[PDB]
Design a protein around this ligand. Structure first.
Ligand SMILES: N[C@@H](CCC(=O)N[C@@H](CS)C(=O)NCC(=O)O)C(=O)O
Ligand SMILES: N[C@@H](CCC(=O)N[C@@H](CS)C(=O)NCC(=O)O)C(=O)O
Ligand SMILES: O=C(O)C(=O)/C=C\c1ccccc1O
Ligand SMILES: O=C(O)C(=O)/C=C\c1ccccc1O
Lengths: 203, 203
């Protein structure tokens, strides 16, 4: 069974969605196709150009409580990094090869940025992540600055916009799209239905 | 047990939150304090001045699916009215006296506007609602245009802004605030905890 998952490492809701999806992948063997995209570009594309939630103090005060609530529900830490400069790490996703390595990348970077609150533009973060994944630090850093890497990122963000993605985390299963970690229960129900039909418990 | 509920009849998420809260009120006798407020004013107050979700076609296309999903979950119709001009009906809430009459007003107006898709500024809607509630149509319509009615509305919206309400539906229980029909599960859990402690099942 395949879910397409769209995220931007600047998003704490994406951090939560990624933890929950990864546990479905590990516990139930669900297949996730990962897509790192530019939330900024996708917003601009649909004309969503007002102030961001991050720039609206009263709303941000609440969302920080909401985020701690879900973190507690999921039994994980959630710590705000010093900035939302996620471009380099988003691009770095496209170095990953196989499913297992793409998932490991996404989990290591999310845990570093939103689990530990490490700035996503920290200059040593590519090396720290390379060590964890057993990658060649220098090859990885060279990839991060390559024209091809930015092209791959641009391509995927474009494909997301074509698919009517307007925010993150967004998940597709078949023709159904859900936006939000708080919609994963709907994805989980859709998944159960498809499991039952494929088991002939349901027509 | 008392929940403060903040809503604007223009909000379909508020329509959903109201259906779920009303069923808690009827099934479990939870006490709801209702507050009709001006979502527009509360947004402006916190600097949330970009385009609204209603003006962003790609996002609105998705939210209409989200809204049908929840409507199906709750076993209720949800039909978009022709406009979001909720001021008159919001003001009309402050005609209501007791809890039972305030709840009946809110349920009748929500069901008319978002259950049936009746324009909230329809000129005959005050009379239709008056008939349903056994009110004096003319007294009700006179109240709707009164300076006092607008003052009461302005007062409550102000009190909401002071309480750091930035959107609707918003629910408070004690010092905890949740925004969204999709957060009522958290309110329900908080409510269960308080029931258990008061039953001495939990410290
Ligand atoms: N209710 C959410 C909201 C997710 C959300 O606010 N995502 C942000 C990025 S973290 C977003 O896509 N903003 C774009 C928008 O609001 O249209 C959930 O619980 O995940
Ligand atoms: N995730 C929500 C969202 C509720 C929502 O989008 N509310 C609108 C009015 S219907 C709002 O308060 N907008 C203000 C904002 O986004 O800050 C829920 O499921 O109820
Ligand atoms: O770029 C954005 O639009 C944005 O607000 C992302 C950051 C965010 C969203 C929601 C809650 C907290 C937070 O930092
Ligand atoms: O006034 C607003 O800000 C607004 O978008 C309210 C309307 C709304 C919100 C979310 C989904 C559909 C919808 O009509």
């Amino acid at each position: 069974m395949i879910v397409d998952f769209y995220f931007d490492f600047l998003s704490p809701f994406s951090y939560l969605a990624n933890q929950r999806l990864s546990k479905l992948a590990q516990d139930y063997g669900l297949t996730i196709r990962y897509n790192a995209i530019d939330l900024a570009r996708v917003k601009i594309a649909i004309g969503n150009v007002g102030p961001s939630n991050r720039d609206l103090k009263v709303k941000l005060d609440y969302l920080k409580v909401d985020l701690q609530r879900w973190a507690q529900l999921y039994g994980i830490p959630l710590v705000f990094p010093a900035n939302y400069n996620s471009r380099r790490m988003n691009i770095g996703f496209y170095y990953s090869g196989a499913e297992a390595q793409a998932a490991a990348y996404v989990n290591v970077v999310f845990n570093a940025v939103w689990g530990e609150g490490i700035a996503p533009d920290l200059e040593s973060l590519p090396a720290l992540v390379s060590e964890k994944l057993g990658w060649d630090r220098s090859a990885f850093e060279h990839f991060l600055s390559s024209n091809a890497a930015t092209e791959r990122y641009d391509e995927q963000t474009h494909a997301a916009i074509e698919r009517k993605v307007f925010g993150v985390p967004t998940m597709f299963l078949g023709d159904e799209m859900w936006w939000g970690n708080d919609r994963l229960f709907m994805l989980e129900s859709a998944m159960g239905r498809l499991c039952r039909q494929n088991a002939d418990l349901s027509s």
